[PDB]
């Protein structure tokens, strides 16, 4: 009893668009990490600054689970020191990242014949995101030298781009659900612990 709600994150019915990524604060609970592994045959499971198997013996102040959907091709960008549309404009991991990145193919759930257009990403931006920044602004992007005045049109684009996930797409272009676990140890009592 009093187990950390990993199901609420991993088994969520709908996931967020990478630009509008969701975060879940896990605190004041027992984290049974052994389930995560015995859960699904996760296509990706990389850890940084931790062994996944050591997590049952560790105690953290806070744990953060960040979920979103991207293409299989872009999963390689959910790592420190990476570049690409996602790393630069959507979800940025710091160089000193301490946690795990878990991804799995969700073509059956998230792609639809004719396209699943709920899943978006930021295609345009004036600068790159700082690690863990989250940009939700749907302000018109000025591609030309002349200003937009907030009005969409020629040389003035809406910043977000849809993926339109279809099941017939290649494995690289299919939707992948991603959960980035971040472990935080602060100068406060550690409340999130593994089972003995």
């Amino acid at each position, epitope marked *: 009893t009093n187990l950390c709600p990993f199901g609420e994150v991993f088994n969520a019915t709908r996931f967020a668009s990478v630009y509008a990524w969701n975060r879940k604060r896990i605190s004041n609970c027992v984290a049974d990490y052994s389930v995560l592994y015995n859960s699904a045959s996760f296509s990706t499971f990389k850890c940084y600054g931790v062994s996944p198997t050591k997590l049952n013996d560790l105690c953290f102040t806070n744990v953060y689970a960040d979920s979103f959907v991207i293409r299989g091709d872009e999963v390689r960008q959910i790592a420190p020191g990476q570049t690409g549309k996602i790393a630069d404009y959507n979800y940025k991991l710091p160089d000193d990242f301490t946690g795990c990145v878990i991804a799995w193919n969700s073509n059956n759930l998230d792609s639809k014949v*004719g*396209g699943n257009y709920n899943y978006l990403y930021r295609l345009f931006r004036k600068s790159n995101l700082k690690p863990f920044e989250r940009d939700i602004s749907t302000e018109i992007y000025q591609a030309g030298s002349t200003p937009c005045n907030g009005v969409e049109g020629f040389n003035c684009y809406f910043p977000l781009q849809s993926y339109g996930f279809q099941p017939t797409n290649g494995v690289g272009y299919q939707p992948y659900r991603v959960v980035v676990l971040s472990f935080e140890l602060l100068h406060a009592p550690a409340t999130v612990c593994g089972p003995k």
Partner: antibody
Amino acid sequence: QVELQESGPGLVKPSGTLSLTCAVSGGSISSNNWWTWVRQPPGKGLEWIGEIHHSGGTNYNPSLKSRVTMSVDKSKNQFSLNLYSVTAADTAVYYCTRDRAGGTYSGFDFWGQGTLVTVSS
Amino acid sequence: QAVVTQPASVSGSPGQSITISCTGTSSDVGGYNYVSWYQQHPGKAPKLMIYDVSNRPSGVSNRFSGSKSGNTASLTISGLQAEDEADYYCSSYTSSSTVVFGGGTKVTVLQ
């Protein structure tokens, strides 16, 4: 608010063509919403006909795929349905509705009042 | 497409609580958490009451509960009021990227 109003002939001759148009009000049809048609024969249950997105995507009941087409008129702000080779079985109240989102089925929020279409000689 | 079966009729008494079942396949109800229930009053368009198995839209009475077990969805109406007398239709996404409706259930409140 978002309002849907079906339009179209009430009578279609057997082996003719049913053509309806749903007129979207209080919301652009260019929204990320799968604009769908659902029918209901008198006193019988509901049957999903198909859907269409502004991008041009379509998806239709496997049962009626071979004789159904839908379209989007962005300038008029309306979506359409064409049911070719109609039979008495196709006599039903035709509802134009929309998915709460433009992804996998998430439930239909807004509906039209329905248009009865009587297929008779 | 797929056959999604619901009980033809479900009867209750005012204040009572009733449950409508919606049994289907693994290519529909049991494979996706995309189930929706509709309430249809005579001569009117269906009303969305529950979406994605359990979520109720803004303005729907909290007396409408949505749940699912395996290949079976269940709409539960607690504290029945006569205005609940209607036809209830479940629905689900399918592996074929299509939507399928249930047979319908005539819910009757004693009068």
